Design a protein around this ligand. Structure first.
Ligand code: ATP
Ligand code: ATP
Ligand code: NA
Ligand code: NA
Lengths: 220, 228, 50, 224
RNA sequence: UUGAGCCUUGAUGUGUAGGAUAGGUGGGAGGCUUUGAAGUGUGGACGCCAGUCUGCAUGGAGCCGACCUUGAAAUACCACC
């Protein structure tokens, strides 16, 4: 059906325009869903080399569309600040080992040096799917209030595959085509600024914006 | 391709091998021969980079994970059967041993918070979530069943100690330098299992065995190290 | 002839070296001597490296 | 070719081993049960099997550092046993020179010769008789063990796996030394044309049936 | 006829613990099924020989996903390779 009609309706060989593609993605509208669309950029890097990995984040003016349980698992000043800053819980070891198994999961996890219990409380399951606090990502910092403020402001994080293609949360289809621009360009600018100095050759070749249920198109 | 550039080593008061230089690279298997007491294992250590020569340079490959087998099949007797294989990969084993200083140190500092935050991330990059998942399956593939995975290495017959020490080198392995692989002499069934394993997979290898028939059936070159 | 030539490179950071001779086959062992280093104008330690 | 020659301190006559029942076990059902056999001052009886059968632990029980669950082994009252272990790391330790290690043996010998001479008969010089014992490599350590056996001069050589790290030029030197040796020995080497070279009383060992003494072991492999 | 490089398409891929031959990257829980199904009979090829797999009419429109032993989550799909 859709997989056999959209294939002939939209051609991925021709490189579309930003304005045409943002409209076409919303124009597909085959199945009914929240339609949380995303992107995929083919970075020119050697992910084989450890230093050319690009794990980072950027604060977006549209966030992700949903709030998570961004709590600071470090008892003390950071946890006290986060509790009033609007986390999902407080920082304690009752939910790290005795509750780390019973409790299913949260959205995010920040850390502080006051009680670095979360460094082992997650163990293998808590951060096995990407829940550990990145020291370079800023999650594990003393400023629990600042971390909670950034999490409320909507700092979206991105990583790399084993070949160097970045895909990450960018926003829902409920945000208009005009609003898509200050998300796409903001993410691209942040990635360009944070690009490693050891990036030989052309480091951006192909941007493809895709739907959760639909396909993807070559934007530029 | 790893290259030796005028390598000399002087043990005692007379040079062992004088100003050697040769190129290793490709899907070939440079088995090397030499009388005991004359280079061989020392040259293998130089190539691996564990020991530096008195003159010359290793001219190492950039990050191609030299995977090695040692001469001693009894040097591992306290680390368990499932511990040796996971310790084969350096950057994983070192990070694991350092991260093991969390549950054993009841005091954490501000810098230590950053360090525990980033070492777990490095562990995730190095696949610590599957570090023990990728080891038991290889250990079963070589022919070591489950019942002795967590048992100590001491309670293993040496013909299987070698079977596990070989698997210790099988973690994303180009450029495997195998020291004396026989000794603790394999039956011959284990020897043919070895030869099929070695000559089926494609990589650059350096054998040092003394078995003429095994070397005939395996290797294509002979990097003899005899006179100087 | 039999005594080879060696240079004691200074350990004060500057590029300076005294050159002497050493019997190179009794045992490999670098020479450590405290010799004057004119560039820094002090008596520093001199480790050998040819 | 390292010139190695095994002498005999005192010649025993009647018979040496005379073992009745061992039944040694570690974790599973005993690797063997009876193994009743005699020696009669013979030669070898090249114990052999597959990897993990328990030939090394059988030799351990015979040499007495491990005792069976219940049984008797006993040796002749004049029996002097030289032992070459499968793994020898408890020996090359305590940071001695080659000279000191080789001199810690010997019965009544001058410090300068008959101990610095047995070293030179097997590929060692003045520049090597001062390097530490714990640094030699493989075949050199095995050769040092051979030298200690040559100086101890034992009647019965247990010699677990002698051909491990040898040169393929020391292998036949040891072969000739063993076939010219006039004492009693056992050995569990897995080599084909070593057992085929000199074995007479070959004893195979299996989890169920322990065969013994077909002959040259060529007739053994022919009957099998 | 046999190599090497590229484009496109189609096949292609377990454990230790299983209802199951799970590549990650995590986006998500509701799509997928009738531009004819659930399952039935017909076999190609591959096959850590258990199974995937696709030409095929008829039979006519249920299945899947979630929970779940688990290091991981499931051809609920898609993009990136
Ligand atoms: N650290 C050392 N210091 C001094 N001499 C050494 C050292 N290591 C080894 N030797 C000696 O120098 C030579 C180098 O030994 P090496 O380990 O290279 O032997 P090898 O040829 O690999 O032997 P084998 O065939 O038995 O494995 C040997 O003769 C040894 O006795
Ligand atoms: N200390 C021990 N504890 C438990 N099991 C042991 C112990 N020592 C040996 N075994 C077991 O006994 C069997 C034989 O051990 P042994 O060391 O005698 O081997 P082998 O047959 O001589 O083989 P190889 O010399 O080639 O290693 C093996 O199954 C081994 O796991
Ligand atoms: Na060696
Ligand atoms: Na043995």
């Amino acid at each position: 059906k859709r997989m056999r009609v959209i294939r002939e309706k939209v051609d991925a060989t021709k490189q579309y325009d930003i304005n045409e593609a943002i409209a076409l993605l919303k124009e597909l509208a085959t199945a009914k869903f929240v339609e949380s669309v995303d992107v995929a950029v083919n970075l020119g890097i050697d992910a084989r080399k450890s230093d050319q990995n690009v794990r980072g984040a950027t604060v977006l003016p549209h966030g992700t569309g949903r709030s998570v349980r961004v709590a600071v698992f470090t008892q003390g000043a950071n946890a006290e600040a986060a509790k009033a800053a609007g986390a999902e819980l407080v920082g304690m070891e009752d939910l790290a080992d005795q509750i780390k198994k019973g409790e299913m999961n949260f959205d995010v996890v920040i850390a502080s040096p006051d009680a670095m219990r979360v460094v082992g409380q997650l163990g293998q399951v808590l951060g096995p799917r990407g829940l550990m606090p990145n020291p370079k990502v800023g999650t594990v910092t003393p400023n629990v209030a600042e971390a909670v403020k950034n999490a409320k402001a909507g700092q979206v994080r991105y990583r790399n595959d084993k070949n160097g293609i970045i895909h990450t949360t960018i926003g829902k289809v409920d945000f208009d085509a005009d609003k898509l621009k200050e998300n796409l360009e903001a993410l691209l600018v942040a990635l360009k600024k944070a690009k490693p100095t050891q990036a030989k050759g052309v480091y951006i070749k192909k941007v493809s914006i895709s739907t959760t249920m639909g396909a993807g198109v070559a934007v530029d | 391709m790893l290259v030796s550039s005028n390598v000399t080593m002087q043990f005692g008061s007379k040079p062992l091998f004088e100003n050697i230089s040769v190129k290793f690279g490709g899907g070939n298997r440079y088995g090397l021969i030499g009388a005991n007491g004359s280079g061989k294992s020392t040259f293998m250590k130089i190539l691996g980079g564990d020991l530096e020569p008195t003159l010359g340079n290793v001219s190492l490959d950039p990050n191609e994970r030299i995977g090695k087998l040692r001469q001693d099949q009894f040097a591992f007797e306290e680390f368990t059967v499932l511990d040796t294989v996971i310790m084969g990969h350096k950057e994983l084993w070192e990070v694991k041993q350092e991260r093991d200083r969390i549950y054993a140190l009841p005091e954490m500092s501000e810098e230590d918070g950053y360090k525990v935050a980033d070492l777990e991330v490095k562990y995730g990059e190095m696949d610590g979530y599957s570090a023990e998942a990728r080891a038991g399956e290889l250990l079963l593939g070589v022919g070591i069943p489950v019942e002795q995975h967590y048992g100590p290495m001491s309670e293993v017959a040496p013909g299987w100690k070698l079977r596990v020490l070989l698997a210790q080198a099988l973690f994303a392995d180009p450029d495997i330098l195998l020291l004396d692989q026989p000794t603790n002499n394999l039956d011959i069934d284990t020897i043919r299992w070895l030869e099929q394993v070695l000559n089926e997979r494609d990589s650059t290898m350096i054998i040092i065995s003394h078995d003429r028939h095994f070397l005939n059936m395996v290797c294509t070159h002979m990097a003899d190290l005899d006179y100087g | 002839g039999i005594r080879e030539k060696i240079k004691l490179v200074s350990s004060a950071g500057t590029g300076h070296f005294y050159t002497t001779t050493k019997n190179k086959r009794t045992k490999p062992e670098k020479l450590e001597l405290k010799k004057f280093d004119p560039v820094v104008r002090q008596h520093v330690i001199y480790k050998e490296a040819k | 070719n390292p010139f190695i020659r095994f002498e005999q301190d005192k010649k025993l006559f009647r018979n040496a081993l005379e073992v009745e029942g061992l039944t040694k076990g570690f974790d599973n059902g005993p690797l063997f049960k009876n193994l009743n056999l005699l020696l009669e001052v013979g030669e070898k009886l090249a114990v052999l099997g597959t990897n993990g059968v328990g030939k090394s632990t059988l030799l351990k029980t015979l040499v007495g550092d491990l005792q069976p669950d219940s049984g008797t082994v006993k040796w002749s009252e004049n029996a002097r046993i030289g032992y070459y272990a499968q793994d020898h790391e408890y020996e090359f330790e305590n940071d001695l020179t080659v000279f000191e290690w080789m001199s810690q043996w010997k019965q009544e010998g001058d410090d300068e010769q008959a101990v610095r001479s047995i070293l030179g008969r097997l590929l060692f010089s003045q520049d090597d008789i001062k390097k530490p014992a714990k640094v030699l490599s493989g075949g050199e350590k095995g050769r040092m063990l051979f030298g200690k056996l040559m100086m101890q001069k034992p009647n019965i050589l247990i010699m677990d796996q002698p051909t491990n790290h040898l040169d393929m030029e020391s292998i036949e030197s040891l072969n000739m030394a063993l076939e010219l040796y006039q004492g009693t020995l056992i050995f569990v080497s897995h080599d084909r044309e070593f057992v085929s070279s000199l074995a007479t009383r070959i004893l195979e060992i299996t989890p169920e049936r322990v065969i013994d003494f077909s002959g040259n072991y060529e007739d053994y492999l022919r009957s099998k």
